[PDB]
């Protein structure tokens, strides 16, 4: 509950409080509409609209009658008597221009936008029109909180919980069958040339005498073309990380249910082949998410800071080693793959020595 | 390799059907007869318009169709409406025909219409995008669902569970009964009922449902899974938006009124009934038989002309194994949409005239040996 | 049991009959084999399969080609872009348009036929059309052609009736480290023979809103796009567009700035660096009385536009002459009428008629519309999918050199390393008989090559193949040996070629290519493991089951201990190669950083990827603390933090390992755009979401 | 190890195929389920387990090493038995041959082709409803958090009956034995199979944190959890991964049953939660392998003190044990967590949400207010 009289005397902006109070749509729809437009008891006290309306008392209520016929709530009277100031001031605010989006051959509008009827406007008829506009205000705000907030495509479940982050990438995955570490990522040339653009601009403005336009042209020119200077600057940018193996990054899976679907790795090597467009991942980390080489695209985010890289240490490839089911047991994600085990099977379980009877005889 | 080896392989090899490998849409659409140059779509339009000739008033007569010149096509496409000629530069196969009605002589204004102009291999470009038009497996006669029996008609799409289509209520049951007895006598549906239901009027059809088809609700003889005895229609679902306009034009002279007309109302009704894009506006949005071409190869037998859709896939249990799947369809071919292998076109099947699926003889013994081994429990 | 007898015809198998041993593999893998066909592009090196069935002869007769539909006679032969001598001497004629009159008909219908340089149905995958040299020389304005005489065949159709859907490769079955999660270790010399072709088309407009730029030339010429048959620059920018301004004329409308390209404040089109330009189509509105383009920039545009206008003018003049000759009796095909109305749409309208407003799917053009079509060859390096015509598919994960490949004691070099342990799990045993029996075949064909005076793994010349045939007893013994091998493998083929006229030609066609092509249909009276035991327990027809030397991950020549057999396998390439990647350090914002349009102005995608969903931020709220997980969303939803991270990247002496980018003393928390929007929308309702102890 | 590489060829197939004990199990076999699964499969399963028969063959040495499965080898080297239709209807006559000697009759191969038809029924409603189940479970499980190492030292020890089927669920759990202080089970006790043992659960111990627990009350599972990790979500995660793996008989019915038990009113409202834990344990552990330390958190997340005064908060002594519905828990507690679930507008127009009550704290509270510290 916010005091509506407190927000309309501390605005200190344009102070245009009269929107409908002054205009009368007399050759003003070309100017007042496009340049400007392009605590509501009816939300809570709306249990009386079955086939008859208990709000037929139009104007001058002077609400002190405790005639409450309702079985759902008994603390509604305490909610009223706690803060009695409800829809008392005369200054009701207007929604901003950002809430309504207006082009092309046909002017397209959205169906929850039904609040422009209040912008287009004997006392017994005007007093009925004010409560008609108040019921239209409530009918607009209820359907806008139901169709634009409560839906899964909406402001709450899509934009208020984060979407479309910067310094990110999305590509298919391969494996590293090499002597390496368990946390190493190999970013290709085309992904690394665009994910690290301002880093290359800083390195080209520091090591060379180039402007930012020539540096941007040198970055965008050599995306699909290999050259030694960009590769040497990539090796320098990898070598600049003194306490880490490289640049700290996070790596996600699109079905994210378990702990292993969100990990943190380190960029250690940029590939030289321009035709290879894939991020090469460790072998031992393939088991904790359900990630195979079946043409799936996986997401990656780049942590800029040292504090963010230290805070992302809670999700690590070593964090899902211990199982969350048994008290003293390492989970099955540590198990090696097929061809890794089969060579040790052919090596160790071979007829290599004579038995113990023949050995000491 | 050795040429004699390829010669002996070619000598001992069953040949595919040339009508189905090249595309049955090529055969059942735009196939000119040697007597006169008239496509099969124009023949379907000519066979559809004379059915509703008994609903026409006295003096009104539909008089064939003529092929339009491209000089007429360029003026009819780029027609000035709001002092602007909007020419749609896009590669689209179309061709334009006329209607040419008449009312006691003195023939009226011709109404041009567009037609999709299919090509070899079930391929057609519309609005820049390539598409493939596949035929639909349609049973001859009536369909037996899990609850009721369905019959196809030209204007009604009713089922059979006590349900039909829809002081002053005495004229509604009279106007319904007026059109119920004469408008439901389409000749092509009387040729479609050649499975044993030989009726003359709909009042005998409702009798023969009650005395002969009454056991088709709980103890039917339809196997519900056999693909034998089908029509394989590709033109009945392609012109579904034109037959609706034909039925709505035929509803004007019979259901509304039966009084004397003039040329000023007839020209207005012809301009309001048959527009330029009657069969074109809902081709790539609702028709499930038209799919997007995504074949990165040269052979058309893989995904081009080897696609079949069922009677339920055209609208945009029954999955029991049958021995007729290996004859007309392709088993061990399971995509995501039809995992049972029912929507597939096998080139080694016998298809006679008008898409009538007839059974073969060399594989009949193995199918009869495998069918009785299935359903025994 | 009756393991020998079988009754399944080719008529009952739709697409399953393209390979033998269909009953050995599983049902799901056998369906995935049919699913994989139809997603395969055409590589440059195509060849026939070694185990040819009776199905591939029928699939080669129904393809996409340029055939004559009926018996007809050619009337006129037209061609776009005439090649001669001079300044307008552009080479490599893409299409030819011929017009015929249908012979043997009561109504002489006129038809049209286009012969292009290529044919592509997929968006970025197509094949070239090689022309028949016999038919193309007989293209005359007075010539009668019969029905179904093919012009411009595809590359998969050979001289005889076969179909090349893949490449034969020497596959070795080893438990290498690179074969993890269906991984492939491919040879570098084998991937050069598996090279698909991509045909792409880029379209742009330049009128009153914006104009072209001067690339591909020096300061004495203007060329907004490469010519037909030219090479694209090492950077992929083709016909970059600069906006139209008046007061920036000494700054931007100078010959120095027309040559250089600004990556910002411009709109370029990025394609493939190494690619040849195939086709160019230019549309033009020429009815406007002010010319929006400045002088000296419209030479190469009208150089194509005049040729296209002359071609469409002759194309309309032919139809007008045929209409003036055959009045009220003209019959035309449904493809020719669309070509005539297209020619009328290209040609300008007279002054008594209103001008046209051309549109391309609710997108109007402004006085120029230039589209180019180019062709590139894609070399596989990584994330390429392959399939051996079975259920087992894989992704190339490591590319070694030719000298570091597994080689046995007979000089055979391997092309692919596949893990063998996945065969018993997915139950696709059809790859066992193809790898094995061919190993009994090529080692036979390398035996009869080395029994006489020849050199293995090398194609013999005519002077040696004509000198080997002087010994009739040796080729008779070789024919008896091949007949015994066919009696072991395929008794129906052996009974077919028991009566073979001139049997020295069979020995010549075996010793020419080094492999005997074995015919094996779907109805074979063959006990498979009995033939296996006959091939193993015999002195002749035995494959070389010896050791295999290779090179490991380190630098060392490693010889394996177990006997390893290497055999032929027919591989193919698949759809969804690695090209749909994205990388963006900064994305444009909404007037809240979502963009969805024709985004082809950057090499690779520049769109923001929604890596943080609701479950992702839930897991980042539970595992990572709720404090530092709000900063990742605040660095995106607030544009000031998005400017501050780039300022910290560009002002530090080290671009990596920066401690603090957005300090919360100058840009504090609470400036998120959807949070403030929701707070404002709830404040106009009259309530607020706060708390107090 | 680069010289010792495993391989597979035709010789490895012919080495195991030409064994007489395998060839004897494929001839003179009646087409009966007892004659195939017990008689024909037993004679080859007794020779696959012999360690002195196949020495050096890569397939048998990979079978004994746990790489290759024996269920996929009986369908290749022995008689394949009774593939099914789309529905669960078996056939009368089975296929005679296996996968080495392939299937080449039309009837048998047409039956075999229906075995791969059920591997494609992957409609998007199943992947939608399992994500809806995870979003319904985790959003209510995320209330309890931040366990602490140590001991809360309470003598309010609960008592539960231990059976044979739920003995794996009582693996890491502290109980009170006679003449002893504390002991953990670890899952090797054949005794205590029918008695009622007094345990130490989270229901009824006293920690100064209002939403945290101790290590001895949670059991020996807490040391496998990292320090900065929500213990609330991981219970629903450990349930949901096994539920999704059971999804990927009628596991959707099990998922809806767990929804109706945990996040609905289908359970009878008991007086104390010590009799609600073994019923949920014997309902869950009979089909889904789940430890009881997760079930204790999933039961404790629906516990509210003083339901007659609308004090929607988690009680620290669990002896109260007052349970209500799931939607009343989502709406009438922690509105910042209520904005993450469906029907966001119903907690807005409620008179109970406009008065300052002492309530819990959801982690989403920082994403709702933008990230303000207070
Ligand atoms: Zn405790």
Numbering used by the authors:
A (entry chain A): 7 to 44, 150 to 213, 216 to 234, 247 to 486
B (entry chain E): 2 to 167, 322 to 471, 483 to 543
C (entry chain C): 2 to 592, 597 to 698
D (entry chain D): 137 to 384, 552 to 677
Paper excerpt:
The ΦKZ non-virion RNAP (nvRNAP) is formed from these early genes by five polypeptides: gp55, gp68, gp71–73, gp74 and gp123 (10). Both gp55 and gp74 exhibit a degree of homology to the β’ subunit, whereas gp71–73 and gp123 represent similarly weakly homologous counterparts of the β subunit. Our structure confirmed the previously predicted homology of the split β/β’-like subunits, but further revealed that subunit gp68 is integral to the ΦKZ nvRNAP complex, interacting with both gp71–73 and gp55.
The ‘clamp’, a flexible element whose position is key to regulate the entry of single-stranded DNA into the active site, is also conserved and positioned similarly to its situation within the M. tuberculosis open promoter complex (RPo) structure. This region, lying within the gp55 N-terminal domain, exhibited particular flexibility, and was only ordered in the small fraction of the data yielding the most complete structure. The ΦKZ nvRNAP complex retains the conserved β/β’ architecture characteristic of msRNAPs, with a shallow active site channel running along the elongated side of the structure. We also conducted subunit co-purification experiments in which we co-expressed pairs of subunits with one affinity-tag and assayed for recovery of both proteins.
